[PDB]
Amino acid sequence: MRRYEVNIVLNPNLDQSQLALEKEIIQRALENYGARVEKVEELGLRRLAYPIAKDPQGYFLWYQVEMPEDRVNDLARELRIRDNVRRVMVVKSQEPFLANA
Amino acid sequence: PSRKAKVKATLGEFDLRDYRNVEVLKRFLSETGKILPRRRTGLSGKEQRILAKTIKRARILGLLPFTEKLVRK
Amino acid sequence: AVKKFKPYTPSRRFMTVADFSEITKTEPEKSLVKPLKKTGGRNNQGRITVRFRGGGHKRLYRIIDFKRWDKVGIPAKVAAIEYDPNRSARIALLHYVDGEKRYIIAPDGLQVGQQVVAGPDAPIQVGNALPLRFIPVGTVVHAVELEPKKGAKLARAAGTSAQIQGREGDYVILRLPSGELRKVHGECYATVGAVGNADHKNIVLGKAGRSRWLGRRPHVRGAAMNPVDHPHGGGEGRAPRGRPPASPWGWQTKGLKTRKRRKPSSRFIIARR
Amino acid sequence: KRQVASGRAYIHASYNNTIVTITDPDGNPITWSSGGVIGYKGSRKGTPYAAQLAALDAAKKAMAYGMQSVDVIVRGTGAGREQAIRALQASGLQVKSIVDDTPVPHNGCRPKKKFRKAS
Amino acid sequence: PITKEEKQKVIQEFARFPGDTGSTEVQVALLTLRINRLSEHLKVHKKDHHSHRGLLMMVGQRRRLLRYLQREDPERYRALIEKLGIRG
RNA sequence: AAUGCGCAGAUACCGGGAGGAACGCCGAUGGCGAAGGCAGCCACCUGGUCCACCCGUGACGCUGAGGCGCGAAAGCGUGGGGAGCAAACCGGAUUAGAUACCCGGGUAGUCCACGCCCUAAACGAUGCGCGCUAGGUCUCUGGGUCUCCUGGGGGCCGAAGCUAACGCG
C-alpha cells in the first residue's frame, strides 16, 4: 500500500482509566477500519508554545498505520467527535535525504 | 550577504524532513518566528524549500509560536 | 427536479409540478387503525369566523405521533415512505421489533431498511431522538418540544431547522426558523436532522383552478366594496386609499404590534427577529 | 488607592495624536493621558513635542499612587513614539525593557483607497 | 492510479509472441484501457477541463494508429474491433 | 478645517464568544500551464513534462478552409450569505463656478452552487514544425568519472550577417 503515519495530540488530564480506554478505542477502531500498528511509541505529557485550549502542555501519539486508501480521509470521524483528542493529522512517510556530511 | 554566524557549516549531520526534533529547527525561526532567508544559511534551493516545508508542517501541532514577540525594540 | 410543461394551451406554459420519485413501494392505506375520518367545515357552531375557505377534494388524516418517549431502548426499521395531503412534509412508516407500526415526519435522507432509535443514550446520526441536554452544540434539530411532556411543536415543516446556540445552566438556547433566540428547558425531546423536501417553495400553480382544488374561494379586494362594510370604498371614480390603511373591523395593518406586553413568557426571549 | 509599585504602560500614536495608558499588571488600567488633556487643537496634537508633555503629565498620578516599576509596550509608529521613551527617565521610576506590539494583519482586511494608492 | 498487474497482463493478453514490450496492436490496447478508465470519473466531476483535453489528446492518437492498422490487412483490422469492444 | 461622534461612561485597556472573507516572514532577476492564470497545511482522484539504459515495432510524418471544446474583469436569470471595501446618492471642505481631486456615511456587486454572455494593451504590440552559423557570465533541474566534459528550461553583454534607424543577435 503506502507508508502512512499519524500525529495525535491528547488531553493531558489522562492518568489511569481514561488513558487505557481511550487507547483501546483508538486501537480497536483502527483495526475496525483495518490497520496494522508496527511502531507504537507514545511520548508522554510534554510542552507547547502557544495556548492550545488554555493548556501549555498535552499528550502525544505516534503509530505507523497501514491503511487501505479507501477510508484514510473518512476514518477521521472517530476523532472529529471526541473533544478530548486535541490535534489529529495523518501524513505519508519517507526519508531519502542526509546532507552536509 | 554578510556572514556573522553561518549556521550551515556549524551543525553537522541533520535532517530536514523530520519535524520531531525541535532542537534543530528552534534556531530556524530565529527570533520572531519568521523563516529565514538564504543569506543567513547558504543552503541551496531544493533543501531550503523543504526547510520551509517542515517548519510549515510542524507549525500546526504546537511546538512553534509563529506569532510572538521580541523585547528590545 | 420539478417537471415543467410545453405551451399547448394558454394555461400550461407556466404550470409546474414537483416530482414524486421519493415515494417508494407503498400507497395502499394502513388497516383498521391510523387513519381516521376527519371533518371539513368552514365555520363553528353558527356563523363564519375565518373568511374564504371551504371547497376542494376529499381528504383523510393519518395519525402521526410526535411524542416519542413512550418506547425507549427499542430499535425500529424504516419500512416505506408515503405522502400526506394535510401537512407539507413527507411521512414515513416505522416497524418496531415487537409489532407496533407508527408514522413519523421524515427527516433529510432516510432510506428503506435503516435503523432508528430514541432514548437518553442513543448515538447521534440522522433520525435519532434525544433529550436536549445531551445533544452537542451547533447541530440541526427538528420537531422540538417547548417545555416537556407536551408534544412536538417547533420547527417541523418542509425544510426548516432550529440550531443550538449554547448551553448555560439548566436551559439551552435555540435559534428558531423565524430568527429569534429562545431559552428552552433541558428535558425536552428533539430529533437530529433537517426536515427535507426542500423544493416545496418552487412550484407555480399555473391556473386559477388549482387554487380552488386546495380549498380556497376567490378573494375580493377592499376598494371594490361599499362603505357600509369595509372602511375603504365609496369613491365615485377610483379612490386613493382614504386615510390610512385599515382592516374590515377597524384596526390598522401597517406597522402595529399586537403582542401582549403583560405575558409571562417574556422572560425567555431576546427577540432578534 | 495606593497599590503595588508594579505597573505596565501601553503607548501609541497613529499619525496625528499620541496617548499613554498605565495598567495594573494582571488587570485594569489606572490613569490614561492623551493629547486633548494638554490643550491642543488639530495640528499641534500629533507633533514630536507633545510626547514628553503627556508622558510627564502621566507621572503626577503614577507618583501620587503606589507605582515605581514600569513596563512599556509601543503600538505602531507616529509622531511621539521616539520621545516618550526618553521622557520616562525624566521621572526615573525604575524603567524596564521596551515591548513590541503592532500586529501584521496577515492578509486580513482590505485597506481603503488611501492605502491602495500603493497598488 | 493504475497498478503493475493490469499493465503487465494486457501486454501478454494482446501479444503475438510472448516477448515484446509493445507493438502496433498492443499500444492501441494500452490506450484503450486508459480511455475506458479516464472516461468514467468525468461523469462524476465534469469540471477538470485539463483532463478533458488530455482525453482528447489520446483519442486522436489511438484513432490515428487505427488508421494505419487497416493499411496492411483488413481482417487483421477486424480482429481488434471485436477483440477490444470499441466503436460499434 | 469642518459635517459626524461622545458625560445614559465614548477612544485606547484585559479574558472568553459568535461571524465571514483574505492567507503575513518563506519570495526572487524563482518555478507550472496550449492561452486566460494559479500561492496555509492535510489526504483522495487525474492530464501534461525532461533525463538514463538504449529493449520491440517500423515511416505510422508536418500544417490545417468550414465543425467542436476552453476563454480575466465588468454585466444578466434562479436560490443561499453579508465583516471589510465599495459604482449610483445625500452631506462637509476647496474654488470666480466644482455635477471632480480631499474627509464622514452609503445600496447593487465583490462571495457560494447551476445555466448563459464571449469581449481586451487575450502584448514578447513577434503564426507553426524542423535543419545550419564564434563565444562570455549567473541562476533552475537530472545522468554522471562533482578544477569540469553532457541532455534540456529562465536572464544579461557580444563574432559574422540583417534592417530606413533604434536595435535583435
Ligand SMILES: [Mg+2]
Ligand atoms: Mg379609516
